[PDB]
Write a protein that binds this ligand. Structure first.
Ligand SMILES: [Zn+2]
Ligand SMILES: [Zn+2]
Lengths: 370, 217, 73, 178
């Protein structure tokens, strides 16, 4: 109400007077459905510039951080009404920040139905459950038989709300959550999301097995961009559409200005021969008109594929890609080391985003595009 | 936007389109960020040989670009692109636009937009370059254009300009060859910010242009 | 009965029928009745979740007893 | 020739100790956190946060872990070993501090008067007394058909008392407006 013989009830129904004079109030205060003990003793007059105020030790621990704000507001407040309103707003923000302290499940809703839904899914999809029963992980199989796991976080009462779902594959997973949706509902949704990008995996596992795959080393299911070795110290990279995987992915080469040169020239005049019905590897072998070194040496150091500046492979994951346009050197280099070297050099002239200069080993013209 | 596509699709009289155009121009600060560009796209499709001046005036009056705050960047960019395409694939937009900021003479309350569009137009079709120089000298001597302007201009919208830095220098070149210290100071600030925010090649071109000024000038 | 294993908890020992041999300690059987059964996986995945849940809502129960007594006073 | 209460827990006290939480050899390591214990399972953790004010701030916690706690002690690496009347259980803390006070057991009976020692050899080895009066030393590093029975036994234990506490809520909302 406007008057505090009714507004005091409407806003702190739990907070009520003991003393004849309405000077000793006691009771509780509600906050997120939690009734906290409170005793509050005003002066003879209804001035808050003095207002004795003790609590629970619970409450004083929770208000460690704001007792100065209490000292401020007790003295600055016009009325006990607005004082307590602001107090409850404060309590809510306090627990909102300290929201890590909050969970308790109802068993017969939760611990009953959840194992029925597990038997619904299959106990063999069951890969893990948490000692809290907070987390649970499950398995889905691509029709090839690739395992795609997924994690799920369960509230106190699960089907009331969405569980927090965490999945490996790259596209934003959408789970249409109704309370009628159960574990198998979201499992079918998981499968439908898997079956959309199924034929992508059918090319990806092929590429994983066949060729000298380079730099999504141990590629997860998220990986839509790949890198392949070919020839020697010339590597290609690919990025594929999960929706049209056999469609031509966008690609380019890394390597030499005499090895990468006729590779693209063949590609330009055979891309029209791209038959998307075949496998991607098979299409490439004819489009590029070559065989791969199909793991032909894979990960065995003959000192060929090495920076020559830093003398390393996978410098910050960076590959020896920049090479010499020379038959005699063919010394491959990183980006960063070659950049920093041709930085200080006097002859190193800079165009838009190019650095020219001499190869460190052979002193022949070498071009770096950033 | 759907409404607009549909109105492009249906059999209509144009007098109604005009009403709607005015209507959106009122309802033009009162739009969310994202669609904005396509609305403007519509407008600039919708415009004609004659109405152009007035609509632009209203537009030039209603666009702010201090108001639009990943909080405005992508969309602004896309906007500029759109405009860029518009004034690429027709000419008279630019002459009208210039006219509009040129005859905005009494206005000592000039907004950011104007310079940005000037750069752009300088970068694009070039017959008018001498027109642009002329007008820019004239507003500078008038003192309607000043330097905290350029400050906030390069403090925000630079990203637009990176890919036309060469325009800035080709201009500053013609700025320092003139008299009237304020003009020369403007060109200075140009060279300064250009070296400041942009990349190595820019910096290099800065130094290389200043040296030329020194030795020859 | 004892922790003959030395794993911490008690187990049971059983002896069968000296008809076997004129010798003790043969035909034994040790067990816990849990996983432990000595003689002469989806099921084993979900127990800790349950055993948490019981004590969890037990703590809830005690908290709300305290709550009860409080407003009574 | 003064004394100062700090928090006042509300159940009988059993254990007090300290930890080097975030322990990231030397005998005396600078303890970061503080721990205090009750009898009916009320635990207290204290930390210094110096956050949210640009000044030094205390960060507190009051946990309520189950069982009438019999005894406990601190393990190196920010751990605590404590004996319920059912089993011995542990709580690790080092992460600022944990929101929930989870705990596993270690498959050992209801001990009392635990006393921990550090090896730094490998791992943690300790000492204890069984409630039956037996001393022991520790070194540290069908069924689903029974499981469903266990699930539903626990559900049946809990739902009764949830309803009971709702009956309290009704009493209380009613007496309030009285
Ligand atoms: Zn390197
Ligand atoms: Zn070379």
């Amino acid at each position: 109400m406007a008057v505090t013989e009714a507004s005091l009830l409407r806003q702190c129904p739990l907070l009520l007077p003991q003393n004849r004079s309405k000077t000793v109030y006691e009771g509780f205060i509600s906050a997120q459905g939690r009734d906290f003990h409170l005793r509050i003793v005003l002066p003879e007059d209804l001035q808050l510039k003095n207002a004795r105020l003790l609590c629970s030790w619970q409450l004083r621990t929770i208000l460690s951080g704001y007792h100065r704000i209490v000292q401020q507001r007790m003295q600055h407040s016009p009325d006990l009404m607005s004082f307590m309103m602001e107090l409850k707003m404060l309590l809510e923000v306090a627990l909102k920040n300290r929201q890590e302290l909050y969970a308790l499940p109802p068993p017969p809703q939760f611990y009953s139905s959840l194992i029925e839904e597990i038997g619904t899914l299959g106990w063999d999809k069951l890969v893990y459950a948490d000692t809290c029963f907070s987390t649970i992980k499950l398995k889905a199989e691509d029709a090839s038989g690739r395992e795609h796991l997924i994690t799920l976080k369960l509230k106190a009462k699960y089907p009331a709300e969405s569980p927090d779902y965490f999945v490996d594959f790259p596209v934003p997973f959408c789970a249409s959550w109704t309370p009628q949706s159960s574990l198998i509902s979201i499992y079918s949704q998981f499968l439908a999301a898997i079956e959309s990008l199924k034929a992508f995996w059918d090319v990806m596992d092929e590429i994983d097995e066949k060729t000298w795959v380079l730099e999504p080393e141990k590629p997860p299911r998220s990986a839509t961009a790949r890198r392949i070795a070919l020839g020697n110290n010339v590597s290609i990279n690919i990025e594929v559409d999960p929706r049209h995987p056999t469609m031509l992915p966008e690609c380019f080469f890394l390597g030499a200005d005499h090895v990468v040169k006729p590779l693209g020239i063949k590609l330009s005049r055979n891309i029209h021969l791209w038959d998307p019905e075949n496998s991607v590897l098979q299409n490439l072998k004819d489009v590029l008109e070559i065989d791969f070194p199909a793991r032909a040496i894979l990960e065995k150091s003959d000192f060929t594929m090495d920076c020559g500046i830093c003398y390393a492979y996978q410098l910050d994951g960076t590959i020896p890609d920049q090479v010499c346009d020379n038959s005699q050197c063919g010394q491959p280099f990183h980006q960063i080391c070659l950049y920093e070297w041709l930085r200080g050099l006097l002859t190193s002239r800079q165009s838009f985003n190019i650095i020219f200069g001499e190869c460190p080993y052979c002193s022949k013209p070498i071009t770096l595009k950033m | 936007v759907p409404i607009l596509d549909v109105l492009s699709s249906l059999r209509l009289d144009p007098n109604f389109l005009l009403k709607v155009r005015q209507l959106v121009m009122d309802k033009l600060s009162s739009i969310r960020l994202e669609d904005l560009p396509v609305i403007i796209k519509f407008i600039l499709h919708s415009v004609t040989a004659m109405d152009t001046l007035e609509v632009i005036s209203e537009l030039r009056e209603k666009l702010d670009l201090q108001h639009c705050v990943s909080s405005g960047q992508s969309c602004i960019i896309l906007l500029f692109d759109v405009i860029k395409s518009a004034i690429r694939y027709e000419k008279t937009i630019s002459e009208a636009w210039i006219k509009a900021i040129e005859n905005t003479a009494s206005v000592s309350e000039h907004k950011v937009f104007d310079l940005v569009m000037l750069f752009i137009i300088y970068s694009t079709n070039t017959q008018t370059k001498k027109y642009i120089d002329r007008v820019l000298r004239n507003k500078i001597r008038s003192g309607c254009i000043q330097e905290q302007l350029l400050q906030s201009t390069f403090s925000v919208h630079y990203l637009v300009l990176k890919d036309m830095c060469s325009s800035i220098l080709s201009l500053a070149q013609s700025l320092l060859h003139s008299l009237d210290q304020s003009i020369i100071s403007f060109g200075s600030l140009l060279y300064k910010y250009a070296f400041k925010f942009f990349d190595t090649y820019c910096q290099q071109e800065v130094v290389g242009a200043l040296v030329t000024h020194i030795c020859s000038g | 009965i004892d922790d003959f294993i030395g794993s911490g908890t008690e187990q049971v020992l059983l002896l069968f029928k000296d008809s076997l041999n004129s010798d003790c300690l043969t035909s034994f059987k040790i067990t816990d009745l849990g996983k432990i059964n000595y003689s002469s996986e989806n099921r084993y995945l979900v127990v800790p979740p349950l055993e948490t849940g019981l004590k969890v809502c037990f703590s809830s129960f005690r908290e709300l007893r305290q709550h009860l007594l409080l407003k009574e006073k | 020739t003064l004394v100062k209460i700090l928090h006042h827990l509300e159940e009988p006290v059993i254990f007090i100790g300290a930890l080097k939480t975030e322990p990231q050899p030397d005998e005396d390591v600078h303890c970061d956190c503080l721990v205090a214990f009750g009898h009916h399972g009320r635990m207290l953790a204290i930390k210094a946060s110096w956050d949210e004010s640009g000044k030094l701030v205390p960060e507190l916690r009051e946990y309520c872990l189950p069982g009438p706690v019999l005894c406990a002690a601190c393990g190196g690496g920010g751990r605590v070993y404590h004996s319920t009347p059912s089993d011995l259980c542990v709580v690790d803390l080092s992460r600022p501090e944990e929101g929930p006070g989870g705990l596993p057991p270690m498959l050992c009976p209801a001990s009392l008067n635990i006393c921990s020692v550090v090896s730094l050899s490998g791992g943690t080895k300790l000492l204890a007394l069984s409630a039956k009066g037996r001393l022991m030393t520790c070194s540290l590093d069908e069924s689903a058909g029974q499981k469903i029975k266990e699930l539903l036994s626990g559900i049946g234990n809990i739902s009764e008392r949830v309803s009971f506490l709702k009956k309290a809520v009704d009493q209380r909302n009613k007496a309030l407006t009285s």
